């Protein structure tokens, strides 16, 4: 035999020991990530260094295997996962310095408290003690205080640490045959010329840019709408044609626009989507929310929850002091077990995160038949995209009424549908230019075309150019203004969310076309849709094994991404906005600033 069979049996061996020991690696990761202790520190030590060591030595001995000799394209793509994620070119001192940097980031970001000067002892942590401060808390002088204090309390210890971290990650990606850290973050969207027509990462930059060009008008109309509705609530702090203040968004560091929805609904005086008190009185806890999720998933034609998914995978605090750094997190442990954690409340956005990571689990069981190195998302985007498509289809008020969630006397008129589309417009489109500018800023930084003295003056200028947000104090360069978000502290890839929202409405266009439900993707709930659900199931089951461009060509009959699903999802909202911001002007102006004015 030739070396292709040798590579096949090597990947067989690697897959089976990878499941065998990465199962308890991910199990100890889950055990630390659900209970904080002192011996779970050594659990992290083993579940880190051990798995990293065996994975690295198994990839290192794979280097002699020629990629081009392989004729089997799943085996081929297995080699481009395994060999290209080879040995880190940093030294032992440099790599351990890098790991200490990551640990320092996570620890000092997870302990941040903005504290008043008169009583510095009594103050709140970021989650869930400071997320309310940027929300319903009016009289924004303390909002300004909390914003400035949080920016200082991340900046004074994480500006040069991030600056030096950038150099280490760029050096790490440089030895990985990639030009910069952005390129190693974009390597997940790589295909071949036989099936995916190559699709280099240059195609990724041009595709991301052409996606962003024609989502800019919709976001501009939304931003003008939000400006006009913050005029009356917030006097003179917003320019009529300028940008909007950064400290006055829905949450901290302007990530989501969720809690602006009570401040931005046009005619929400009528009964609307909010069901939270009915969630309280119906007895629908986190567990009952999950049973609702599996009725939705056996309705759509996806497998339900396993017995391990019953007994383990505790979401909230179990009442036993198991301290959790709770964030919406799914767990593909490998083998057969899959887990879910977050501080599961009963609110709308957390209900959609419950469906979101539940769809993550459905994704993970769907390609559970794949090899372990193929047992990931079809790219960085699909993996979140499937769960978010599930979360968006379950969120439709028609679905809420059908399965008894929503009140019987609810009205499905045009205006309440516009209000729901507005809530989705905040929770998605208020994040699209934010995530685009943040990931593009990461790409510029990792490319290194902007030196460290001008990262911030760049950061706040496409904050006024791509997402159209102004800030009260630019913090000069001594602080680390873009480094106070969760995914940037722990250094998660942030094009995941942008391409999640890109593929979100493409998959929802598929799940409104094959499911054939009426309504222009607004009330297009996908429940009791076996054919579209099973078509989505092959789209999940091919997974990473076949390149995601071919997967997109299979699901929506288009090998490339596009904006037009955003149009078919938001066109009555869009047409409403041109008949809503007719008084104001669509767009923003960088000239007006709260420090300048």
């Amino acid at each position: 035999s030739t070396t292709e069979d040798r590579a096949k049996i090597f990947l067989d061996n690697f897959n089976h020991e990878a499941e065998d020991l990465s199962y308890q690696s991910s199990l100890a990761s889950w055990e630390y990530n659900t209970n904080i202790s002192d011996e779970n520190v050594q659990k992290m030590d083993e579940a880190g260094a051990k798995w990293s060591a065996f994975y690295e030595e198994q990839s290192k001995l794979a280097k002699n295997y020629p990629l081009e000799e392989i004729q089997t394209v799943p085996v081929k793509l297995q080699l481009q996962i395994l060999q290209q994620s080879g040995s880190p070119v940093l030294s032992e001192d440099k790599s351990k310095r890098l790991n200490s940097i990551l640990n320092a980031m996570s620890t000092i970001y997870s302990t941040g408290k903005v504290c008043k000067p008169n009583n510095p002892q009594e103050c709140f942590l970021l989650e869930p003690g400071l997320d309310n401060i940027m929300g319903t808390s009016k009289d924004y002088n303390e909002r300004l205080w909390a914003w400035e204090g949080w920016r200082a309390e991340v900046g004074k210890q994480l500006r040069p640490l991030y600056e030096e971290y950038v150099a280490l990650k760029n050096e790490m990606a440089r030895g990985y045959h990639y030009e910069d850290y952005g390129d190693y973050w974009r390597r997940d969207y790589e295909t071949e010329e036989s099936s995916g027509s190559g699709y280099s990462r240059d195609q990724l930059m041009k595709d991301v840019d052409r996606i962003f060009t024609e989502i800019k008008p919709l976001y501009e109309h939304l931003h003008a709408y939000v400006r006009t509705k913050l005029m009356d609530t917030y006097p003179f702090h917003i320019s009529p044609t300028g940008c909007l203040p950064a400290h006055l968004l829905g949450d901290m560091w302007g990530r989501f626009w969720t809690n602006l929805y009570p401040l931005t609904v046009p005619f929400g005086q009528k009964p609307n989507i909010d069901v939270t008190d009915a969630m309280v009185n119906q007895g629908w806890d986190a567990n009952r929310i999950f049973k609702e999720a599996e009725k939705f998933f056996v309705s759509v034609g996806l497998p339900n929850m396993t017995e391990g998914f019953w007994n383990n995978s505790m979401l909230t605090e179990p009442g036993d002091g198991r301290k959790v750094v709770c964030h919406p997190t799914a767990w593909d442990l490998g083998k057969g077990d899959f887990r879910i954690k977050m501080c599961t409340k009963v609110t709308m956005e957390d209900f959609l995160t419950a469906h979101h990571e539940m769809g993550h689990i459905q994704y993970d069981m769907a390609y559970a038949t794949q090899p372990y190195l193929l047992r990931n998302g079809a790219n960085e985007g699909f993996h979140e995209a499937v769960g978010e498509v599930m979360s968006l289809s379950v969120a439709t008020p028609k679905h809420l009424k059908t399965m008894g969630l929503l009140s019987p006397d609810f009205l499905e008129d045009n205006e309440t549908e516009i209000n729901f589309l507005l809530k989705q417009a905040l929770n998605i489109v208020g994040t699209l230019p934010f995530t685009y500018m943040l990931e593009k800023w990461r790409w510029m930084v990792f490319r290194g075309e902007i030196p460290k003295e001008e990262w911030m003056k760049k950061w706040w200028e496409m904050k006024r150019d791509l997402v159209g947000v102004v800030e009260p104090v630019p913090h000069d360069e001594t602080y680390c203004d873009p480094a106070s978000l969760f995914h940037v502290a722990n250094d998660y890839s942030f094009i995941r969310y942008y391409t999640r929202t890109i593929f979100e409405f493409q998959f929802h266009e598929a799940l409104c076309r094959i499911a054939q439900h009426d309504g222009p993707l607004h009330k297009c709930d996908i429940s009791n849709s076996t054919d579209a659900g099973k078509k989505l199931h092959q789209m999940l089951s091919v997974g990473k094994s076949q390149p995601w461009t071919v997967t997109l060509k299979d699901i929506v009959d288009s090998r490339n991404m596009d904006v037009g699903p955003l149009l078919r999802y938001f066109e009555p909202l869009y047409t409403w906005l041109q008949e809503q911001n007719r008084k104001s002007y669509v767009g923003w102006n960088t000239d007006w600033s709260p420090y300048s004015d």
Partner: protein
Amino acid sequence: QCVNLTGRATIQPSFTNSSHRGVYYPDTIFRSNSLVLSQGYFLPFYSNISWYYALTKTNGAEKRVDNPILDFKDGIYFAATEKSNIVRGWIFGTTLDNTSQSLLIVNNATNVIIKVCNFQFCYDPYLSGYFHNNKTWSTREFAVYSSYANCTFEYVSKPFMLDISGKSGLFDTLREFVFRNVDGYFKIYSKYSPVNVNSNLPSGFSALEPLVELPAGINITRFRTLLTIHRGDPMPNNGWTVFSAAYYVGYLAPRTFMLKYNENGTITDAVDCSLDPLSEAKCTLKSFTVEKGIYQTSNFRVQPTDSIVRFPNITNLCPFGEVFNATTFASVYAWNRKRISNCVADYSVLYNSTSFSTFKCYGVSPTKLNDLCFTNVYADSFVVRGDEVRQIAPGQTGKIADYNYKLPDDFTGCVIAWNSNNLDSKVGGNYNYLYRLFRKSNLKPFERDISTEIYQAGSTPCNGVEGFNCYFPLKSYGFHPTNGVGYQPYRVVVLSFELLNAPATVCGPKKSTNLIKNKCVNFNFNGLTGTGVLTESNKKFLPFQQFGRDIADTTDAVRDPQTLEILDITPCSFGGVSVITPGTNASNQVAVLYQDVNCTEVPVAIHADQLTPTWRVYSTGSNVFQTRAGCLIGAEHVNNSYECDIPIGAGICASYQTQTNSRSVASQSIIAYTMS
């Protein structure tokens, strides 16, 4: 205490035709209307039913008030029924003694109670009726009528309606019935309804419905009748005298019917298989309509009398208790071969266990593996995963079939698997079980591979190390109690069964009934089902082996495992049969081929000497025809023929010819004129 005074008669039987009468419905609840064969104790059609006429036209009038000896064996058809409430009540003792248990039968509506008790009495009991103002004429009479005490079996209920008053005409009654008591089932199945004839057993359609089942089940081998002679006024001579009656006694034999079970067990054309060649042709057709042409019948001219089974007297408890509750925790590379040796196992009782996952068999179904029992057996107990349980099926090839325990493409056995959660799962990881995911080639079926070699992947001479191109095949499962159902610890036992000529070793739990001497029976032996006469004939048979073959797997010879004696099976009737011209049309007579053996051996070797009179006037004692394919009785030779064209009639010209034109007395026949 009863003397045979004036009035009694001799045996003087009237061996008349049983007609198309007396078919009861087993399985009273409605079925899937299958027109399949119904085998068991059943009534012969048109047999020599003993009619005795207890009439009173004259003083004597050949009064059948006698009490004749009458054998029960495997059932009775009793049609001693008349609407005038005559001779009601009967005594059915096994030997008709004080030792024997008498199962009385009540055919009147005044007290429907069936009790066994003891009922010790003399040769003749009696009953009478003088006068009563409610058209009952005091049917209960002051007499002894035996006695009842310490009753082993009792049935008391409301005295529901059966019959009353008197018949308008001579035998205006169709209330026939059939009894046989077996295994807690008693048939009192009747057809209470009036139908009038002149004086005959009517040829009305046998469609008597089920009535009741009783849990008595006491064995009956003989019985007796009981009479009612009226004291008051049967005739104006005021003597003891039974009124005008004509009563019937027939017996049930092991045979087969064809029952539709269309609407709650009803039938359209009841066909007793051992009646005539038309009937056996109908039984083979599995329907209720005769075809037109040459036709081969099933081998049911005489049916098996008994279902004899002869298993080895083992009575051992198999180690299956420590197979499914096994502490032996193997792996798929170190798969066990726990031989069960010589024992009796509770086959398919583990299939009844609801805690078990996959009992797919692939070759021997769970039902037929209790009675067909096995020469050799192995356990093959080890551990696999859920996808590996899907893999362990014989037709599926993969890393647990090709590179581990492999099954043959037929396997003639079964495989069980179940969950061993909290049995083989360790919270830190249960790595103690292994598999071999690497081998130089696919494993042959039932090939053990403990060899933990370097696997020699590529051209690398490893010799004890796992290099860049060298890989360890003996790799662990890695179970966890939190692990998923597809990777859950599953215990599998591949219950490999095989049957050879060797004597049976582990068999299913049942009682081996005592062997018959010489009778066409349903032999089972060591699971070898079939039909034939058991004979003690000795042939050149190897002493150790038991499964004979004879010719074309006729398997004549089979060993009794107790006394180690050969017991040949010579079939009571042979194949090679052919209905020359059937009776769908008015050609009512019929004849089927029997054998290349001459028809003079039919009553003695094919054993038709004790059959119904239909097999006498149709098959043993009637016209004989012979062909190159053999011989038959029922058709006659003739010198006239023509070109043989139509496929009806085997080789010598015969078809659906008409004979009504010559004479209309008998209409068409089966004379071999011409293949039309």
